[model samples]
Target: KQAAADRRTVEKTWKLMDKVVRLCQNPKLQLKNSPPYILDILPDTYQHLRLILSKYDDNQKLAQLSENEYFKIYIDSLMKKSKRAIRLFKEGKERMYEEQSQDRRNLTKLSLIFSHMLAEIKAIFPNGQFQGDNFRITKADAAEFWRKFFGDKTIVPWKVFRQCLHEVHQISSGLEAMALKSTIDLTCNDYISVFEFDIFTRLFQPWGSILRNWNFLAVTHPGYMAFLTYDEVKARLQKYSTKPGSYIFRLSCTRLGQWAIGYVTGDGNILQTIPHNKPLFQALIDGSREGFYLYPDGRSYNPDLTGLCEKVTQEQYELYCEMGSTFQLCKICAENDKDVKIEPCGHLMCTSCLTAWQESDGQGCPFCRCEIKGTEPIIVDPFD
Candidate 1:
């Protein structure tokens, strides 16, 4: 939810009475004459900021900046592809409905199971009412059907019946579909899955880098931009002859779900963003990468991002910590712990510990709350 404006960070930060929950942007703002004009906001951020615009001027964008070229491109592409992803997700979501809707082997099995269960329920409550069409029940009536169908005063107790019913619910809808919904949802306009992540990576890198190209030259990463002083930043604006008093935040966000870069910029806003998150630098010096393959030269990063993160051997954290790797340590392991390995966020950890850590609370890195997608990556783990 990162934003460069006075008001638009719906994704990165949420606030209340005395508490605030958010991530990654201490970057900028102008309280007096506020405008966090995003140069090119991601889909949801734009959708949100656009709504807020009506508040200021009929003509002004809601609480934020103006037209977004890249997001529009991304949005258009996804909406096109989403025609398919969304449809497939829906089919996958209502799998039971879908499977039952058209045809399947389980139809007879389900019909028989339902007949027996309903008969059991009928024995319990002679007055219990119901009707299903060829094992087909209306979506609206599904809940009520289960309610009366619950076994009570018979073999199927309310508890076990309730539990079995829950299993049916799981088949009907699981987190997997919700995950797809989440992609199609507000947070992202979104991708798949495994190989799709790579395809999405290829897709987003262009748009992501376009944000990089907005006000700066190639080779200067968004990370480096965050750390520069205003004077240093102004030079680029001037170099491009950008209008004065104009606020525009330019940043990188990929549909691939790679972590966002506060590559953001503001002509009117302010960003003293710190870029203390380099990891690959040290892996180069140490010959410690294991479980990951390494390439000999930068050429390997052909088309770019040819580089990726990976795990280093245990006790090798010093190699990355000294460089301030963005990848946070497993909260328990911290950065410098012994026998450290690496996680998807590109920081050091002990994959061995990661399994243990997962066994306990079983979630993302304890440090940044960034989801740990996996144990090893290659860009950072240059180890042999």
Candidate 2:
């Protein structure tokens, strides 16, 4: 019987070790922080072996079989070679237990927070019905709940949204709430589910506050000129005869997923593309060197965005001013920086735009409407 059990042990080790060796041999099996070879998997392999053996026999003796007489000979031989693998395995097991506990603790916290939020929702709207795990409320119910909760009989959509957010998050303003309401209005559904409320929590408390603010502006801000081309935007500005401090916002013509501001100056219309990853609000705060405030429609933007955004420093705003004057963009296409000079007229357009202009049939300087002429490369000097 002892010999048979020993044979079973041998079979189990071979079966298990085959899987371990195969897993270690896989090219995609990666370790954190260190990346030399699968030799690091040695510790994990031993731990796996011990764990599997423990499952077969729960006396704990099977787990320590590596320290047994003949087994010690094989393990000691390996230990003799690596010396630190067993130590690493021990540390790995310790770290694994620590992480498991941390995950459990965080999950408990998450469950409690979800429970409290759900309870508050239930307390506010008792008429909401539950379908399986999800609780459902209609837009009317939500509106009524907010109105009654705030004891204000006369409440608008934006006001209701603001009160709901203010009660839940304790960190939203009237304007910010209005923006968020506009965001939700995009897909305004009659019924609000528990799943929808879960989504609301995530939106209300985003990973990046800047991203949330930008998204609010992107969807609702009146001046956010989305998808309009430079030529179209310029035409509108000219037609409106935008005042000196008036500017229009639009997605960048040249850069992908970036923003651009076109402001009318005393001299001409100057377009400044915001640097990649910079906030639109920050750029607006910085304004043109001459100070842009009025929208293209002659509406003034609310300068004080205290609760809605971060404050831009004077030094940073001045840096934006310095960078704004550096770009000499093409009037047409607006796709590339002006690199070619139209002969005789001394007007500029990028090479790509120039090719398009030449192909579009019989063109002159777009600005002066001068006669069709040859082009010259405009050499840009770094020192200048």
Candidate 3:
């Protein structure tokens, strides 16, 4: 009865997550005309999943069972259903890709629809309190007139929408990669960033303790004798010189040192040096001079340092400065002229000359031959 209940729970959780994933791909979430409805849904969905997973984690349900027991009774049943759905989708895609098929053309259309659903799901369940729409309206009068005259400018071009879908698919694939590499059992921390490691450590510490107990069993059990040798036990013990209580202490210390070097030097680049050597000391001093500081309320004794943190060698800095000063002309045109306009590519030229050149040439950039659909007049700031 318990096993059946567990299977049902796992399957239910998987279906919920799959729905959330599908909703995240919604195109309405991306459209300029629609108010961000997806933004309202995503965090609630994520929180719901988190709550479900927390129950399993706290209960130590999976840890008590074998891999086969867990998978057969829980994971495999849910995954099998998901796999079948994916297979059907793939088969449909294959049919669409056949010669002169409308289905193939429709595949691109379908991808956009799928993307819209997923995007909406993500927006609604976003990690935090929602920021309002971030889209820009260039030429507000033109946009407003078009919308008012035509009615419903919310629909995106299918090709552009397909590209957005492809980008979102790539992002989804990246999250899956992170999950696989980290061997995360729970979904909550699978997509976490390296910057959030401290929070993750705290959250997973109980699980780690559970695993440590399992490790102790492996070391002591005669049945596991073939797996872990006596020497392996000794090696593991040597690695943990301090007690388990010191795990957070060690992590804190390491983080403190890292912050001290990164803060003082402005540039966080660390100089590799022989241990306990003068080069390391000099680097630390140099980092201090460049204005590195310790974290607020940190226990470390490292002093805050201040100075310009130059990553490049003295020779490189001089060469770059000389080049900048000597090149009075626009780097792109090599034409020495006043009233210069800087292109997005960072090449400087006289605004009038570049505008005329651009208009006559019809949309090719002078420097890199990149296609420019149109040019805008440079906005010159008096302060600049």
Candidate 4:
């Protein structure tokens, strides 16, 4: 009778622990995976599992008992192993949360500085005209504007966080952003005078999704014509194609550090200097003007440029705090273990979840729905 009672208790405990694992990994509760959220329910269950495990020897024979009698022993070990695995997962998730939070906070600090700087610019440049959407600071006032802009305590650290001085400077620096040579044709020297506040914010914010993928787009795409002068680009485009859609992406010689698109129109070549603040890829996308292709080479412009140079619009910071840390959950099940990464889209999902996703006739990764051309295991811990 005592043996029968013990068997019943073991079966009940096994079922309870399965429920515990599911609840612990629940995406909503797991967002704040601290002891506080679990203290009421888990401690007693942990002790119950321990009590059951204590009765058995490590290498006790199973055949002496019924065929299924030794199932309790395996359950004990599985429960304990799951406990250890969850602890590792919690550590990885916490670290990911900290990193994502830090970047999100730093971007906010940078925005505040830009708000101050823009007002300062407006006050100093009283004669600065608003040409279309951008406020033109003119070539004459560009040097003066730069000098007075950095005069204030704009470099002061925002908080007690332990970021490096270089990192802080990179977040706050206006000089590097304004060094684009857009206005050099009208002036003797190179200095960016045209200001598109919104576009600049998107392009130079340092820690955004758009800026993160800029170098990747530049290297992978043949449409990017790097380091070629405007004249050189014109000479090439003139010889290449006059059939309207033919275009080449090039660096403008007059507007150093700025990008331009030179495409054919009938028998003529027309060049448009891309705005400094606009992302080069975004400009290329917009500059296609209904019909455009790479200069000389006829690679068609991809209208559905999903992941390349796309901007991640984080909800308002208040919503961020409400939703908790912004670390990405597994795209398939929205669970903790983001251990499998998919290619092109560069999104992640749990390994088992991804396998199940594939089995269910899943077309692609949940995030972008891009084809799974390649995959790699995500390294949650370098030391491990």
Best-fitting candidate, scored by TM-score: 4
So what's the TM-score on candidate 4?
A: 0.28
* Local distance difference test, each candidate: 0.28, 0.42, 0.31, 0.40
The alpha-carbon deviation from the true structure for residue 81 of candidate 2, after best TM-score superposition, in angstroms, is 62
TM-scores across all candidates? 0.19, 0.27, 0.17, 0.28
Candidate 4 worst ten-residue window by lDDT: 181-190
10 residues in a row with least lDDT, candidate 3: 245-254
Residue 178's C-alpha lDDT in candidate 1?
26
Rank the models by lDDT, top first: 2, 4, 3, 1
TM-score-wise, the better of 1 and 4 is 4
Best prediction by lDDT:
2
- TM-score of predicted structure 2: 0.27
The global Cα lDDT (0 to 1) of model 2 is: 0.42
